[PDB]
Design a protein around this ligand. Structure first.
Ligand SMILES: Nc1ncnc2c1ncn2[C@@H]1O[C@H](COP(=O)(O)OP(=O)(O)NP(=O)(O)O)[C@@H](O)[C@H]1O
Ligand SMILES: Nc1ncnc2c1ncn2[C@@H]1O[C@H](COP(=O)(O)OP(=O)(O)O)[C@@H](O)[C@H]1O
Ligand SMILES: Nc1ncnc2c1ncn2[C@@H]1O[C@H](COP(=O)(O)OP(=O)(O)O)[C@@H](O)[C@H]1O
Lengths: 24, 34, 370, 370, 370
């Protein structure tokens, strides 16, 4: 978001959610 | 006198590795004097 | 109303607080004649001081009371102050308070005896001793940066950050202007021109100030100096006799950068500044590199800054920017600092009065140092 | 008066301050008091013996750093009081403490005396209209906008996990461990000493923290990266000097998963998360694995999510859907929650008024704390 | 192996060498390489440009002293290798290095690169059958004949405390500080210049070390004796000149208890001992206070036991029995331990063979060394 982007401690180029595979 | 006291003392040097290796849990050098 | 009096081993710079330049500047020397049992003429002074001792070099034995920034003969030192106050300045020591200057890491005995004389002998209303290196910052108006105040007696490097000194980072070297003069006399004698006597030593010092310069590349300059006779200059003595200094011209000042020549068994003046910065905090090193100040009259050699820049840059990191601060008026930079500090209304509280001396004792000077 | 309440996120590393309604914290500064260690010699030097926030960061080399709070517990209250005074000062928010209510965010399972003394400051020393203490985990849910989820908040001072389901918080399933970001910095320092780089000074430890943040990745398989030759990533110090971190890069952050490395008889961070879920009733366990929320600064390590998910998957039951959601503003999530909660009209009933505290005392805070 | 192992105590001040079984080290010489600074003119004059041990002690005035190792870290490896060559030479042990196994005793928490390079020399330059490196603290326990005890080994180079219980060593409770005997000698030199005694030369610094050993007492109350007028205790220099040491006797050695005097942000020797015990488990703390073992040359100062016991008693818990044990041969304790350990048959299994080193490399030293 461009609003929070001004802050120094922002995560960039990272996935939002880590999840397991649905298929066994 | 100090030599006589420690004369028959032994250590187990099998599997010994003091180094900062992460693999395979905790290690304690010198197992026993068996 | 206050007096600034720098107690230099070579030259005594004295004047009133607020003045731009010192009023009275004379050599700190006492000349006693080599008188025999044979009758002498009229108008004969037992001991000459300053310009008089410099005028009558022929007969007078010139003895510097200060050796390596330490007062060896205190009785003669009092006669220098007496000539400074009564004769040169034309002022009573009872009227004005006196600001004095000390070199860093000096013997404790100097401050103890210094304060005793001024309060007891001269009966001054107040006396404050200041560090020469600290005063030189006031002249440049800089709170941060290291100073290389090289005098006739000793050379010292005192790094100060935002007006805070690092006492552990202070380095003192006995190598100074007076040792360079003695070195020049020896190598000139090897060339042919012999200088032995005290009067001749002073003449060689006057020659040194005129001819001698710092080389950027020592080996390349000596190689070129050996090849061509373009660097060779003539000098006219007090007598009709003329001398050709030759390659020894730029050889004398090299000892500052390579003390091995004189045999000091110490690091060079460029290494002392670097070593002091390494002893300093890692954060402030950047600012010390940016603000390397050169002070005193021993840094008035032509091209000393060029040699210093090269040597410090080699020692310093490649990414770091090294800036040397060398103002035209370095010689009087310490005294001007004293005049600025003495003029400041804040310093009015820092003065030690006669009453404070009588109550506490001479030990009061040790408490009110830093 | 209903003046807008001030949100104060009392973090171990950095304190985040601002008024309710603000989207981001305006004023974020390090949580420590820097005092000058060196002696003042100049008359125009830096004034004050106390430096907080950007003044301390700029003039770090001069100052001696000392953290008042350790593992989210205020050791020195005198220093903690001055930091809250700094929040209200002209440099930070610049408002009267008597006009605005405050919203404080403390860690879970702290001593009762800690809250009592902290409250005394905001009611007695500061005449604050109203004070409300809130949980870190509950605020994170307002920021994320989810009623159901496990909040794993791994900070610099403390790491804790609080499972909250559809607004309800299970107080018996809350797990807290003392080992946090500050312990990894100390553990990395040990590896730098083994390489041969000494950082004894309080200022130098802040550079070690910066080195960790710049160049430190979490290994997915420790035995693979242990065996494989590690790339020696150079870091440039303020002076210019380069340090090769090498294998210590991934060995330092491993402490979070194996506390036996530092030599602490405790569970790993991955065990804390799963164990907290396993303590909850059978019905909710599957939903808690579905709704996992990461927070705190110690989650910012490269490959944190990948390693954590692998460790949770091994400990977690077979054929269960594990979805770990990380907000991009991991550091600022807690404060953002505070602003959202504070903006609500229900907040008027939630806080304890100055008059209410004076009548009942500490008891009111203890009842409403959780 | 039939050939007795050689014990080499690589101390910063003096290297102690001898064969296992020997009651005392036969071969003890200062750890530095002296090179002649003056020019050789006559035929039949002293042969060689390198002087080590008694030859350097006899003709010290001619030579320039240069210590290869500082704080137990080899600065110049070329010089350190030549001294190890001197240990095997006709003047010292007079034996082949390839015939006898070696036992090296380095300080704890030293750089890995120092240990790696040091070992490489004894396998590459010297064709040694087997090398085992041992800790200073562990060897001291063999000499005393105790499995349980805290070993406070304050050497010339480094001061460290290692708590060991019934053979077990807690590696996380080990505390190391660079400040040691050599730093007090440099710190005393500072006071000698302030008093007005110059010792610029590397040979003159060795006289300052001799002055320190002869005339220095540790005050029970430092501020009391600092204020009180001190008796000017005279010392006779090698040439015949008399120097008055005065207050510098007790003000110089105080550095061990107050590192803030030099300006280093480290713990005092008394804090190192107690802090190392406090890190240990609650059950063992009382036993570690009961079993305290002093080692190293820097404990030989008059009133060390009286000052240390007073400082430990203040820091230590109330109603705890504090017994400080001093071996009569404090200086030789570490070497004797090496001889005792080396004489044991269990020592054979501890060895790293030449063949083993060639196969594994540097890894073998890290795997088998503690
Ligand atoms: N232009 C110059 N060229 C060469 N040498 C110089 C020059 N100016 C000064 N010096 C040397 O520097 C020495 C001291 O400089 P000076 O001009 O006396 O300053 P100073 O502050 O009076 N020294 P001090 O007596 O300790 O206060 C002289 O004795 C000369 O040897
Ligand atoms: N990019 C990063 N990578 C790894 N660790 C980081 C990073 N940024 C910050 N940290 C660590 O996280 C800490 C910040 O913790 P913080 O979120 O302020 O805790 P709190 O919740 O107590 O306020 C820093 O001191 C540092 O140790
Ligand atoms: N009598 C003494 N009084 C005070 N200090 C001493 C005395 N004897 C030796 N020392 C100091 O102890 C040092 C000896 O250190 P040492 O224990 O031999 O070192 P290491 O344990 O590293 O081999 C000397 O260099 C000196 O500084």
């Amino acid at each position: 978001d461009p609003k929070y982007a001004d802050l120094p401690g922002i995560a960039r180029n990272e996935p939002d959610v880590y999840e397991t595979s649905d298929l066994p | 006198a100090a030599y006589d006291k420690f004369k028959d003392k032994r250590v187990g040097t099998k599997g010994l590795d003091f180094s900062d290796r992460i693999g395979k849990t905790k290690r304690t050098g010198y197992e026993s004097g068996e | 109303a206050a007096l600034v009096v720098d107690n230099g081993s070579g030259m005594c710079k004295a004047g009133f607080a607020g003045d731009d330049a010192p009023r009275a500047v004379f050599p700190s020397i006492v000349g006693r004649p080599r008188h025999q049992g044979v009758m002498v003429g009229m108008g004969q002074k037992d001991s000459y001081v300053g310009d008089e001792a410099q005028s009558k070099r022929g007969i007078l034995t010139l003895k510097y009371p200060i050796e390596h920034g330490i007062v060896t003969n205190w009785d003669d030192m009092e006669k220098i102050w007496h000539h400074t106050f009564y004769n040169e300045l034309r002022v009573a020591p009872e009227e004005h308070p006196v600001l004095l200057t000390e070199a860093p890491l000096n013997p404790k005995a100097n401050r103890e005896k210094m304060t005793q004389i001024m309060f007891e002998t001269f009966n001054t209303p107040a006396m404050y001793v200041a560090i020469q290196a600290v005063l030189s910052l006031y002249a440049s108006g800089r709170t941060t940066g290291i100073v290389m105040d090289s005098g006739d007696g000793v050379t010292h490097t005192v790094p100060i950050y935002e007006g805070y000194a690092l006492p552990h980072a202070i380095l003192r070297l006995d190598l100074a202007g007076r040792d360079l003069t003695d070195y020049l006399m020896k190598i000139l004698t090897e060339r042919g021109y012999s200088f032995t006597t005290t009067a001749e030593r002073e003449i060689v010092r006057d020659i040194k100030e005129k001819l001698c310069y710092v080389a950027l590349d020592f080996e390349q300059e000596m190689a070129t100096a050996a090849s061509s006779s373009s660097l060779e200059k003539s000098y006219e003595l007090p007598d009709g006799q003329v001398i050709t200094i030759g390659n020894e011209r730029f050889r004398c000042p090299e000892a500052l950068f390579q003390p091995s020549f004189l045999g000091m068994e110490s690091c060079g003046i460029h290494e002392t500044t670097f070593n002091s910065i390494m002893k300093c905090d890692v954060d402030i090193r950047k600012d010390l590199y940016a603000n390397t100040v050169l002070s005193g009259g021993t840094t008035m050699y032509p091209g000393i800054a060029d040699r210093m820049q090269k040597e410090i840059t080699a020692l310093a990191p490649s990414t770091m920017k090294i800036k040397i601060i060398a103002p035209p008026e370095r010689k009087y930079s310490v005294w001007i600092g004293g005049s600025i500090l003495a003029s400041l209304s804040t310093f009015q509280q820092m003065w030690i009065s006669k009453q404070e001396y009588d109550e506490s004792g001479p030990s009061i000077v040790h408490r009110k140092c830093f | 008066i209903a003046n807008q309440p001030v949100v104060i996120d009392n973090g171990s590393g950095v304190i985040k301050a601002g008024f309710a309604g603000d989207q981001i914290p305006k004023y974020c500064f390090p949580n420590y008091v820097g005092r000058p260690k060196h002696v003042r010699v100049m008359a125009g030097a830096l004034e004050g013996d106390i430096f907080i926030g950007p003044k301390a960061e700029e003039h770090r080399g001069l100052l001696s750093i000392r953290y008042p709070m350790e593992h989210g517990i205020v050791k020195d209250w005198n220093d903690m009081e001055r930091i809250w005074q700094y929040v209200y000062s002209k440099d930070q928010l610049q408002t009267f403490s008597e006009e605005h209510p405050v919203l404080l965010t403390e860690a879970p399972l702290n001593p009762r005396k800690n809250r009592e003394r902290a409250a005394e400051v905001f009611f007695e020393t500061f005449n604050v209209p109203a004070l409300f203490i809130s949980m870190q985990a509950v605020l994170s849910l307002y920021a994320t906008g989810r009623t159901t989820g496990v909040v794993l908040d791994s900070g610099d001072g403390v790491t804790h996990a609080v499972p909250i389901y559809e607004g309800f918080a299970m107080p018996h399933s809350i797990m807290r461990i003392d080992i946090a970001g500050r312990d990894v910095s100390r553990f990395l320092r040990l590896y730098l000493r083994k390489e041969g780089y000494d950082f004894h000074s309080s200022s130098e430890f802040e550079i070690v923290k910066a080195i960790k943040e710049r160049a430190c990745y979490l290994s997915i398989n420790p035995q693979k990266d242990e065996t494989l030759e590690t790339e020696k990533a150079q870091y440039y110090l303020p002076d210019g000097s380069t340090i090769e971190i090498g294998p210590s890069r991934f060995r330092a952050p491993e402490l979070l998963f194996r506390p036996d490395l530092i030599g602490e008889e405790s569970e790993g961070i991955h065990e804390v998360l799963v164990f907290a879920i396993q303590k909850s009733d059978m019905d909710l366990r599957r939903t808690l694995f579905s709704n996992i929320v990461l927070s705190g600064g110690s989650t910012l390590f490269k490959g944190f999510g990948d390693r954590l998910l692998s460790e949770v998957k091994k400990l977690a039951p077979k054929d269960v859907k594990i979805r770990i959601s990380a907000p991009q503003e991991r550091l600022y999530s807690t404060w953002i929650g505070g602003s959202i909660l504070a903006s609500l009209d229900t907040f008027k009933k939630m806080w304890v008024s100055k008059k209410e505290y004076e009548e009942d005392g500490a008891r009111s805070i203890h009842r409403k704390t959780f």
